[PDB]
Each structure stands twice: as structure tokens, then as C-alpha cells.
């Protein structure tokens, strides 16, 4: 298992523009296109990406090619943050990708948030991080998905994606 393999589970693969969780235009492996409710505005940022006239369609590998895109600005993102970076210097391999999947489904604001949930990791108190993470409204909305990312910080292994 892996950060892409790990991702690819939580978000799956569309290949037509759709509405995401929180009825936002998205369209491949979770890319969010835009939270303006026009259906045309998605579009215009979706031949953008692309760039060619999609008209809402695109292939597999224009799909693999947004993902590759998206860890590689959430990886740096963590990484560009005075937040985050110390928290995942701090981590192990297995519990990195936990972050970043957390960075890529909310952003690197929305993550920098858990402030508390963060120093608790920073810490190795697994247990205490994964309570002070549920109560969240990450948890509420996305609750398979969250406890799959908190499992997985809890334990340091990928049994919650096995
Ligand atoms: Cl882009
Ligand atoms: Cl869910």
C-alpha cells in the first residue's frame, strides 16, 4: 500500500465531471474543480487542467495525470507549511501518507486547524490524537473515510485499507 494506492480507495476514479461530497464539481481522482454551483464554470476550469475542449470528459491518464499533480502539491504543501512540516518530520512512513490524505481531501489550512489533534501526534499519543480527531466535523460528514485515516494514525499500519 501506498500514499497513491491509499488515495485512489478514499476518493475513486470518475471520469465525468461530478458532484463531490459537498456537492462541489470535481471530476477524476477527487479533483476539485470548483465551488461555484455552475456547471460551466466547471467546465471552463476543467478544460484549463487539461488543456484541450474536455466538454466534461477525460481519459484514465488524464485522470492519473491531475492525481500525480495533487499529492505532489499536497506533499509539498505539508512540506511548505510551519504547521505541518514539524508534524510530519516527526512521523513515520505510514503515518505520513495519513496526513496527506488529510491534506489533500481538506487542504493544508484546513489540516493546520487541528491544531490540538496535532500536537498530540507531534507527540506519539496515538490514542489521544485519534479522540481529539473524531470530534470533528471531518468525522461527521466523511465517517468511513475518517475512521479509515484514523486507524491508520493509531496504528502506524494500513489494516483499515486492507
Ligand atoms: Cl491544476
Ligand atoms: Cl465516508
Do not use: C
Request: avoid cysteine.
Amino acid at each position: 500500500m501506498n500514499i497513491f494506492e491509499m488515495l485512489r480507495i478514499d476518493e475513486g476514479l470518475r471520469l465525468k465531471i461530478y458532484k463531490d461530497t459537498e456537492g462541489y464539481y470535481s471530476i477524476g481522482i477527487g479533483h476539485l474543480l470548483t465551488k461555484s454551483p455552475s456547471l460551466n464554470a466547471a467546465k471552463s476550469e476543467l478544460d484549463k487542467a487539461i488543456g484541450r475542449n474536455t466538454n466534461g470528459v477525460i481519459t484514465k491518464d488524464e485522470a492519473e495525470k491531475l492525481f500525480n499533480q495533487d499529492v505532489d502539491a499536497a506533499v509539498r504543501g505539508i512540506l511548505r507549511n510551519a504547521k505541518l512540516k514539524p508534524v510530519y518530520d516527526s512521523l513515520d512512513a505510514v503515518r505520513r501518507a495519513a496526513l496527506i490524505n488529510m491534506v489533500f481531501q481538506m487542504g493544508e489550512t484546513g489540516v493546520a486547524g487541528f491544531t490540538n489533534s496535532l500536537r498530540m501526534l507531534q507527540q506519539k499519543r496515538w490514542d489521544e490524537a485519534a479522540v481529539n480527531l473524531a470530534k470533528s466535523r471531518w468525522y461527521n460528514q466523511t465517517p468511513n473515510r475518517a475512521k479509515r485515516v484514523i486507524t491508520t494514525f493509531r496504528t502506524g499500519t494500513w489494516d483499515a485499507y486492507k
